[PDB]
Amino acid sequence: AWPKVQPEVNIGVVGHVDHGKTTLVQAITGIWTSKHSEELKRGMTIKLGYAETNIGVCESCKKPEAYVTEPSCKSCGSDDEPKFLRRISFIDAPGHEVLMATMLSGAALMDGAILVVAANEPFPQPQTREHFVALGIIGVKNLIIVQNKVDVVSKEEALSQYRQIKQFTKGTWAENVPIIPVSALHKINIDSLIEGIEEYIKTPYRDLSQKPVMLVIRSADVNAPGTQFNELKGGVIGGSIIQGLFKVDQEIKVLPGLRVEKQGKVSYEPIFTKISSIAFGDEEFKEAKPGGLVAIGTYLDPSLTKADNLLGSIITLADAEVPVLWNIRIKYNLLERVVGAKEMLKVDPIRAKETLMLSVGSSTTLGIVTSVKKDEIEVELRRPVAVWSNNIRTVISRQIAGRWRMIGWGLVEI
Numbered sequence: 001a002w003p004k005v006q007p008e009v010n011i012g013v014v015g016h017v018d019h020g021k022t023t024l025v026q027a028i029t030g031i032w033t034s035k036h037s038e039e040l041k042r043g044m045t046i047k048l049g050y051a052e053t054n055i056g057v058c059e060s061c062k063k064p065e066a067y068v069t070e071p072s073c074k075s076c077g078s079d080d081e082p083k084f085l086r087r088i089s090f091i092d093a094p095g096h097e098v099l100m101a102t103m104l105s106g107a108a109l110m111d112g113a114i115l116v117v118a119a120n121e122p123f124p125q126p127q128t129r130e131h132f133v134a135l136g137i138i139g140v141k142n143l144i145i146v147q148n149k150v151d152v153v154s155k156e157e158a159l160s161q162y163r164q165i166k167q168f169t170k171g172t173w174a175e176n177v178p179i180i181p182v183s184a185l186h187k188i189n190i191d192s193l194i195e196g197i198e199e200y201i202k203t204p205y206r207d208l209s210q211k212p213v214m215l216v217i218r219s220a221d222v223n224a225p226g227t228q229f230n231e232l233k234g235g236v237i238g239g240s241i242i243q244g245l246f247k248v249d250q251e252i253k254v255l256p257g258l259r260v261e262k263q264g265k266v267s268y269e270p271i272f273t274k275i276s277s278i279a280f281g282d283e284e285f286k287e288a289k290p291g292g293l294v295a296i297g298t299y300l301d302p303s304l305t306k307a308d309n310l311l312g313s314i315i316t317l318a319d320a321e322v323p324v325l326w327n328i329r330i331k332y333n334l335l336e337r338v339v340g341a342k343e344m345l346k347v348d349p350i351r352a353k354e355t356l357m358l359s360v361g362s363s364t365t366l367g368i369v370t371s372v373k374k375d376e377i378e379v380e381l382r383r384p385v386a387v388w389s390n391n392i393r394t395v396i397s398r399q400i401a402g403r404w405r406m407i408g409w410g411l412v413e414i
């Protein structure tokens with residue numbers, strides 16, 4: 001039979017609102033992650049979506065139909081058992097223009113991505129561009145472009161759009177990114193997509209000797225219906241491990257941690273705890289490695305792990321030396337244009353005293369620019385950040401026309 005292992009790779013699903021991201025994740029995994037009525041009432045799904053699947057190959061059948069997402073070869077007309085390849089997970093990022101920050105949060109977890117482009121809409125829509133550029137900046141360059149909703153357009157329309165997309169990727173880092181036509185709704189040509197995922201989004205090399213670091217996704221910020229969060233022994237903290245590994249019974253800390261407030265003075269103090277259990281999907285494990293949304297059981301009271309006063313952005317081993325900073329220095333670069341805006345806009349230079357939004361790991365923090373000199377800024381953060389490394393790229397956003405727009409990026413210098 002097929003093994004039960006944790007997912008070994010995270011694949012983002014990005015693109016403009018209503019282009020078919022959640023439907024595509026369903027076509028691949030069988031799982032619809034969002035709540036239909038909530039989406040109806042709000043006109044959007046604000047949480048990240050998360051789902052998993054095993055991937056196999058029927059070695060007798062021919063490709064792409066030989067690829068399967070369950071232990072059967074019936075889809076390619078064979079009674080043989082498919083060979084297990086790997087388990088993968090998807091991170092369904094919101095496409096709505098008011099939700100870039102959430103997308104950026106999700107993007108911190110991606111090892112690769114699928115950009116979903118609706119065939120029946122003008123390419124490229126504002127969040128098509130914004131998400132594409134964000135992926136570029138962050139370094140999620142193992143990309144597949146999917147032309148979705150091919151069932152509603154003619155061959156000529158699809159061809160025309162294809163030419164637009166080729167023209168778009170031409171002369172960029174994505175010049176050789178494949179473009180795969182599908183219908184997510186009708187599950188048309190999904191096997192070619194799986195084939196593409198195996199070809200273009202290889203599981204990255206993981207150096208398990210690195211210090212363990214996990215980026216935290218608060219439970220209120222994610223729809224992960226398939227992942228067990230058992231509070232029997234205490235609060236469960238979900239997220240994704242970006243380096244090293246964690247093990248049951250290990251001592252860990254949540255950083256920046258708990259908001260304290262002693263005599264007008266405000267600080268965030270680390271929350272130490274211990275791993276009581278580790279879960280992926282509906283299975284328990286002795287250890288957890290990068291890839292997948294892991295559920296780390298602790299011995300903490302759930303009232304703490306769910307608290308607004310807990311700034312839980314990362315988890316590390318208890319021994320880890322991690323600066324927690326209220327004021328940071330960033331060596332930045334600005335985009336030329338506000339790529340996510342409807343109007344054609346140049347991004348203005350960074351000005352002292354302006355408010356910026358900083359995406360660091362899975363966290364989002366507003367800050368005031370105290371100093372701007374050359375290609376470095378100093379910013380006083382509304383809440384501190386935990387800087388677990390010297391090589392950390394933050395994404396910079398600015399409020400424009402009542403929405404937060406990505407305008408650039410930088411290195412957090414410590």
Ligand SMILES: Nc1nc2c(ncn2[C@@H]2O[C@H](COP(=O)(O)OP(=O)(O)O)[C@@H](O)[C@H]2O)c(=O)[nH]1
Binds near residue numbers: 016182
């Ligand atoms: N005709 C057609 N409709 C689709 C397809 N994929 C998604 N849709 C529809 O388009 C709408 C947007 O899909 P959704 O996955 O919610 O887009 P998201 O906002 O990017 O997650 C939904 O009503 C889907 O039923 C497709 O391949 N063909």
Ligand SMILES: [Mg+2]
Binds near residue numbers: 021022023034045
């Ligand atoms: Mg959706």
Ligand SMILES: [Mg+2]
Binds near residue numbers: 185186
């Ligand atoms: Mg139909």
Ligand code: NA
Binds near residue numbers: 028054
């Ligand atoms: Na599956």
Ligand code: NA
Binds near residue numbers: 065066068075076191
């Ligand atoms: Na198949």
Ligand code: NA
Binds near residue numbers: 110111
């Ligand atoms: Na990544």
Ligand code: NA
Binds near residue numbers: 153154155158
């Ligand atoms: Na068609």
